[PDB]
Amino acid sequence: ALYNTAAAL
Amino acid sequence: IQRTPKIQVYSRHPAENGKSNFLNCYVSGFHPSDIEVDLLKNGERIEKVEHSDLSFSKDWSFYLLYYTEFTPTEKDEYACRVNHVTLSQPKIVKWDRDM
């Protein structure tokens, strides 16, 4: 299962 | 950076004339991901060729498996034609049953 929140660079 | 494709052309199963098999062209170690890969039958491009979903290695370079169902013969010549930004001209790797 994928991670939920992805922070932008 | 750019990284030139490593290429291997080979059959999924031991080559046996008259017996259905799969012709593979594994391209790896390249970057960027845009690449042109065609499997050829006697110099001519094969249409029913599929490829794996783009993935990459620890060093970020990409790898893709292109393959098609085929039946080898003593005459028919097979090869993989690869074109990538790192290449001046499309590279052609002939299929060798022994490799």
Binding site: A1, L2, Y3, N4, T5, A6, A7, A8, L9 | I1, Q2, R3, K6, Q8, Y10, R12, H13, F22, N24, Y26, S28, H31, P32, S33, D34, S52, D53, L54, S55, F56, W60, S61, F62, L65, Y67, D98, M99
Partner: protein, 275 residues
């Protein structure tokens, strides 16, 4: 018997028209199980292994929602990086991200990873302690500063040590028939005369899983690297792998050479010697 779950994401900007090409693939060890291709018609995360199809609608809906969110983040990232690197809007660039976790032989969390590359080079990566970041340059440094302030590491660490491992174990169980099965390499040697005085012995390792394997040649009991060649491990295309190592030897002296195959699927390494 350690295992891992990894997700690979690649986004390529296409300045001529439209949004970046986005491709995500998920793997458990050396088995791909899901994928998402922005170019595909479904616009959904799709199964690539039989054992993942067991998951219900909510799974697929959620993975799709999350992977689409990922593609948008990458889209934004491509723009952000273009700026950080003061690059033209006309060129195509690539952002890659890979993350996942490993479980050890004890089936507990062993390690987590979350790294990013821009145009094929390390950009920023979570360190092993999952608390600090490795920034390769000053563009990455700025990301690092922002991620430290937003406590991104803490959030990732929670996923990597918790959720990630939990699902990895779930998939391992669900697809145990293949995922927890090792396929020992099927080995054999071939002989090819290259001249009247020399021959090539090629040691084949076929249809094995996982991909990790070691093939070594020995001449009279001592490792030999000269006169040898070993191809990179390659996918057979049916989920297994292939590899071979070859050595050129004086014709008639084939018996002195032995091929050694080490693989997780082999209780003891195999030793092959030409007929």
């Amino acid at each position: 018997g350690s295992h891992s779950m990894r997700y690979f994401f690649t986004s390529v900007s296409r300045p001529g028209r439209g949004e970046p090409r986005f491709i995500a693939v998920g793997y458990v060890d050396d088995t791909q199980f899901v994928r998402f291709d922005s170019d595909a018609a479904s616009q959904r995360m799709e199964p690539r292994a039989p054992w993942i199809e067991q998951e219900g609608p909510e799974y697929w809906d959620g993975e799709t929602r999350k992977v689409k969110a990922h593609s948008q983040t990458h889209r934004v990232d491509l723009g952000t990086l273009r700026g950080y690197y003061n690059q033209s809007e006309a060129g195509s660039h690539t952002v890659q991200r890979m993350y996942g976790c490993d479980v050890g032989s004890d089936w507990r969390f062993l390690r987590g990873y979350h790294q990013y590359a821009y145009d094929g080079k390390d950009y920023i990566a979570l360190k092993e302690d999952l608390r600090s970041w490795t920034a390769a340059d000053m563009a990455a440094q700025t990301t690092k500063h922002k991620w430290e302030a937003a406590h991104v590491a803490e959030q990732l660490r929670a996923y990597l040590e918790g959720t990630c491992v939990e699902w990895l174990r779930r998939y391992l169980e669900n697809g145990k028939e293949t995922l927890q099965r090792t396929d020992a390499p099927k080995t054999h040697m071939t002989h090819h005369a290259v001249s009247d005085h020399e021959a090539t012995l090629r040691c084949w390792a076929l249809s094995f899983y996982p991909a990790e394997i070691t093939l070594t040649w020995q001449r009279d009991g001592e490792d030999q690297t000269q006169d040898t060649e070993l191809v990179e491990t390659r996918p057979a295309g049916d989920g297994t792998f292939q590899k071979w190592a070859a050595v050129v030897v004086p014709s008639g002296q084939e018996q002195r050479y032995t091929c050694h195959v080490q693989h997780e699927g082999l209780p003891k390494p195999l030793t092959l010697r030409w007929e």
